[PDB]
């Protein structure tokens, strides 16, 4: 009764955890607590096997631990700056090579899987700082330039016509812009990691830069030059929808250095580079 399915969605009780059953004292030659970690399998012993448990009816649910929930929250992935200082024509537009590698918070979550396939919801938060006192009427244009399409080189480049590319025009004082994007890869899943090159020579590139080309985000202040200078900062947020992930992996332990690479820095006293806190000795809690 799917309706029953709907009620479970509303209460977040789709995936229930099992109950603890009552157990008793035992004396046998089946020793569940004993095993061999060498096998590469986790011992499957439960509390009822080691202690004498009572019967407890588990109410906990695992909905929130789903991959959909874990990766389904908007996080900042970029902060775009259009700062008008001394030349409107040169400073009223910019571009960004799209990627989910610049902000540690969301990059780390996605990188807990080797491959992930998902649709994206992009939300933009623009804020206009009145450096001289007035913002006038700010209208912005954010254009998605897929790899190959012409990239604008001036604030009036013909590419801003957007004859085929997707552009979102936002007007100051209206709700934050937002749109969805379907799974964009030429493969079946996005590579979070890639142990490969784009050639077989000492100068070939290594890593996800070979596979994760997403294009460019070109943006500009549509409004023409105003007397008062403004600094417009547009923060881009991303959220994964309808997610699937494969082959889980260890979380990033040290800080990120660059995009598309697992490269890291190591100082002279390494314990400062990882979250591991030095213990005084084996017996000091």
């Amino acid at each position: 009764n799917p309706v029953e399915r709907y009620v479970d969605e509303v209460l977040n009780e789709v995936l229930v955890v099992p109950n603890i059953n009552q157990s008793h004292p035992t004396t046998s030659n089946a020793a569940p607590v004993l095993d061999a970690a060498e096998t590469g399998h986790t011992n499957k012993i439960q509390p009822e096997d080691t202690i004498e448990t009572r019967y407890v009816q588990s109410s906990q649910t695992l909905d929130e631990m789903s991959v959909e929930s874990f990766l389904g929250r908007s996080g900042c992935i970029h902060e775009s700056v259009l700062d008008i200082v001394d030349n409107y024509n040169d400073q009223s537009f910019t571009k960004w090579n799209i990627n989910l590698q610049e902000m540690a918070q969301i990059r780390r979550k996605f990188e807990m899987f080797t491959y992930a396939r998902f649709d994206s919801e992009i939300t933009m938060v623009p804020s206009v700082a009145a450096k001289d006192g007035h913002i006038g009427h700010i209208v912005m244009q954010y254009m998605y330039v897929p790899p190959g399409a012409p990239i604008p080189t001036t604030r009036d480049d013909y590419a801003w016509q957007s004859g085929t590319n997707a552009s979102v025009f936002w007007q100051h004082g209206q709700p934050f812009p937002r749109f969805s994007l379907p799974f964009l890869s030429i493969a079946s899943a996005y590579y979070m990691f890639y142990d490969g090159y784009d050639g077989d020579t000492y100068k070939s590139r290594y890593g996800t830069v070979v596979t994760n080309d997403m294009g460019t985000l070109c943006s500009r202040i549509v409004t023409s030059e105003q007397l008062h200078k403004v600094k417009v900062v547009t923060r881009i947020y991303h959220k994964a929808k309808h997610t699937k992930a494969w082959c889980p992996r260890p979380p990033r332990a040290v800080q990120y250095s660059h995009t598309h690479t697992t490269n890291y820095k190591l100082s002279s006293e390494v314990h400062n580079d990882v979250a591991i806190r030095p213990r005084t000795n084996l017996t000091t809690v």
Binding site: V3, Y6, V14, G72, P182
Partner: peptide, 29 residues
Amino acid sequence: GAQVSRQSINYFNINYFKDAASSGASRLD
């Protein structure tokens, strides 16, 4: 267009746009 269901507690589960990428979070399990 959307999937009306009945038992009476209807669950009009609407999808307002014509692309699959447009809908909200997926059902679990």
